[PDB]
Amino acid sequence: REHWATRLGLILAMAGNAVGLGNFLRFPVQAAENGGGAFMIPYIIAFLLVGIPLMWIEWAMGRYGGAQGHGTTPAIFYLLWRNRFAKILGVFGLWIPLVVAIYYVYIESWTLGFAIKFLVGLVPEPPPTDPDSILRPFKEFLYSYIGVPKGDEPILKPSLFAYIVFLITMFINVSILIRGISKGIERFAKIAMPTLFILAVFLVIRVFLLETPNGTAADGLNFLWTPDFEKLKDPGVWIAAVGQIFFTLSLGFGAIITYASYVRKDQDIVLSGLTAATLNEKAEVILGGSISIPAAVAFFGVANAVAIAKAGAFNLGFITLPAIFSQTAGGTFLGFLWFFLLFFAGLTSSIAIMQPMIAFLEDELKLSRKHAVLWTAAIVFFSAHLVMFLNKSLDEMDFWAGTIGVVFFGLTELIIFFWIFGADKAWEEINRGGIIKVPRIYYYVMRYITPAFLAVLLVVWAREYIPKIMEETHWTVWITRFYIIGLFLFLTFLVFLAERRRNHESA
Numbered sequence: 001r002e003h004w005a006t007r008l009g010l011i012l013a014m015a016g017n018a019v020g021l022g023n024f025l026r027f028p029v030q031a032a033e034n035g036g037g038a039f040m041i042p043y044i045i046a047f048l049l050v051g052i053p054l055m056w057i058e059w060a061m062g063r064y065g066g067a068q069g070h071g072t073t074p075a076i077f078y079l080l081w082r083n084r085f086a087k088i089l090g091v092f093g094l095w096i097p098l099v100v101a102i103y104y105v106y107i108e109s110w111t112l113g114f115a116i117k118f119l120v121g122l123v124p125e126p127p128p129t130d131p132d133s134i135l136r137p138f139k140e141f142l143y144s145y146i147g148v149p150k151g152d153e154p155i156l157k158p159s160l161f162a163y164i165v166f167l168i169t170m171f172i173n174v175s176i177l178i179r180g181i182s183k184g185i186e187r188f189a190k191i192a193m194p195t196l197f198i199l200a201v202f203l204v205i206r207v208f209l210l211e212t213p214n215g216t217a218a219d220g221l222n223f224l225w226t227p228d229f230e231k232l233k234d235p236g237v238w239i240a241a242v243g244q245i246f247f248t249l250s251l252g253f254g255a256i257i258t259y260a261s262y263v264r265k266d267q268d269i270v271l272s273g274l275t276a277a278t279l280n281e282k283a284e285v286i287l288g289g290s291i292s293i294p295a296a297v298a299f300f301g302v303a304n305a306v307a308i309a310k311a312g313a314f315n316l317g318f319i320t321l322p323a324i325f326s327q328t329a330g331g332t333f334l335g336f337l338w339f340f341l342l343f344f345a346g347l348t349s350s351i352a353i354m355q356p357m358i359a360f361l362e363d364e365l366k367l368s369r370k371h372a373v374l375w376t377a378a379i380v381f382f383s384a385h386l387v388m389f390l391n392k393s394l395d396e397m398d399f400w401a402g403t404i405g406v407v408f409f410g411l412t413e414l415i416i417f418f419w420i421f422g423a424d425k426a427w428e429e430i431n432r433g434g435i436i437k438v439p440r441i442y443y444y445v446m447r448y449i450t451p452a453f454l455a456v457l458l459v460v461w462a463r464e465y466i467p468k469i470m471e472e473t474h475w476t477v478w479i480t481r482f483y484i485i486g487l488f489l490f491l492t493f494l495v496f497l498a499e500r501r502r503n504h505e506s507a
């Protein structure tokens, strides 16, 4: 099997796994929609009860499976629970990454397209005071990029440049992955992670220099970091906080497990996982949290910045921030650094959610790496056409795989690992090779607190929110549901094909 060459390269590839578009696009939206500081308290708690333990559990599962030549959950779940239903539950560990990748790479390709257009100065020209006259040209710029529907039909019509930049973006992701783990994902993380930290800090600095009649960047920092204990009783904030923690640390996407299956059997995972998790949080709450919201609060005030964040998941990042930057000297180049930052943010994360499908093809179907990467890309490139052309197809995928699915699968992999396999055998397998040991209190969090926390959460979804999504959406949502359900069917057939190759090989 292939291995991470260096300790540092493993951490940067794991941090590059986690530090992505969620740090800089999703976290600002999720924080502002939910009252700023009121969001932080459930966010910090969820990090301590959910994010940290699941990080360790997935590192253990990956490394455990990797010592037996398996990197994906269809095989690893069976290694933990010898039962066909573990193989079937394991398909989610391929389905969730592949579904999420279908829409993540596309959004990643926007930032590459926006970066190119901002670098070359092919950007809108706001008329030099009215905010709408400054924002509308950038709303119209993004809407023309992805092709937001102008009539009644739910059809997207992306620009030719967007589609070509998507092909370019895929080609960029293939070029890294086809070189492997050590000569591909690892080498690129040693380059991208410094680049990304540098850019973010500079932007944080430049945003902190913003002052207008409506406020300063400190006003956004106070809004984000001022508690509001009157919201701790809202199931929505807790749902939003735990869903963010999952998304940001790459938990429930089968990606950490696959990356961890390339860690040598003896090597530490306790300090490693903690560092990468600690890295991703600094990336959000310090860097991601200090760019979008302070800048939006700085030009518009808190209430309008909150209103901007509630308008959509991309308004703040693809419309508001460049519009804000367009009012400052060299703001076009500042936009380029912003969208170039997002491109390495997503690229280090898109290669992470595409490695599982590759690993499954190499490990379980014995495909060469070249063929495993290329077939994986072909699967993503084709499938992405559903996200590109059907309005709100992206949303449905992010909900079922990137929102519901990761919390379901996260609870699934904890029970399989830490209950069925055995809590004590799991505790042993987490701490083995540990440069440090997992604190004794976390054994009781993993066995009892975390699974009940998620169980209650998933029950609040299933009763109070999902009924609106099964009955109050446009009929076209079943087009995406049908496709992603058939995608699951296809992956199980591969699993079935992988256990039949294993019966003929042993014979």
Ligand SMILES: CCCCCCCCO[C@@H]1O[C@H](CO)[C@@H](O)[C@H](O)[C@H]1O
Pocket (backbone or CB within 6 Å): 157, 158, 159, 160, 161, 163, 385
């Ligand atoms: C069922 C279709 C399977 C894949 C066919 C993809 C067709 C891509 O079509 C292309 O889309 C671009 C963006 O709108 C346009 O700029 C081009 O005119 C068009 O050739």
Ligand SMILES: CCCCCCCCO[C@@H]1O[C@H](CO)[C@@H](O)[C@H](O)[C@H]1O
Pocket (backbone or CB within 6 Å): 116, 160, 161, 164, 165
């Ligand atoms: C990174 C290189 C990407 C090259 C994409 C070329 C897409 C060409 O596309 C064309 O470009 C013209 C000039 O801007 C536009 O007027 C047209 O709308 C567009 O069809």
Ligand SMILES: CCCCCCCCO[C@@H]1O[C@H](CO)[C@@H](O)[C@H](O)[C@H]1O
Pocket (backbone or CB within 6 Å): 385, 386, 389
């Ligand atoms: C669900 C994935 C398939 C959707 C992409 C299909 C691309 C359709 O292609 C479209 O054909 C039209 C007439 O032929 C042209 O007006 C457009 O230029 C072109 O975008």
Ligand SMILES: CCCCCCCCO[C@@H]1O[C@H](CO)[C@@H](O)[C@H](O)[C@H]1O
Pocket (backbone or CB within 6 Å): 155, 386, 389, 390, 479
């Ligand atoms: C999943 C649905 C997304 C598909 C994108 C629809 C592209 C709309 O393109 C349509 O293609 C039709 C057949 O070629 C033509 O009759 C029309 O000229 C054209 O409007």
Ligand SMILES: CCCCCCCCO[C@@H]1O[C@H](CO)[C@@H](O)[C@H](O)[C@H]1O
Pocket (backbone or CB within 6 Å): 048, 049, 438, 439, 440, 441, 442, 445
């Ligand atoms: C619910 C999650 C709590 C996370 C905070 C744990 C802080 C670690 O706590 C420490 O753990 C050590 C090893 O068990 C002990 O030696 C110390 O008594 C204890 O202070």
Ligand SMILES: CC(C)C[C@H](N)C(=O)O
Pocket (backbone or CB within 6 Å): 017, 018, 019, 020, 021, 022, 023, 100, 247, 248, 249, 250, 253, 255, 349, 350, 352, 353
């Ligand atoms: C699906 C994951 C790779 C997402 C990534 N952890 C992010 O925060 O952007």
Ligand SMILES: [Cl-]
Pocket (backbone or CB within 6 Å): 144, 145, 159, 160, 161, 162
């Ligand atoms: Cl364009």
Ligand SMILES: [Cl-]
Pocket (backbone or CB within 6 Å): 153, 154
């Ligand atoms: Cl219709």
Ligand code: NA
Pocket (backbone or CB within 6 Å): 018, 019, 020, 022, 023, 247, 248, 249, 250, 280
């Ligand atoms: Na993240």
Ligand code: NA
Pocket (backbone or CB within 6 Å): 015, 016, 017, 018, 019, 020, 021, 344, 345, 346, 347, 348, 349, 350
């Ligand atoms: Na990343």
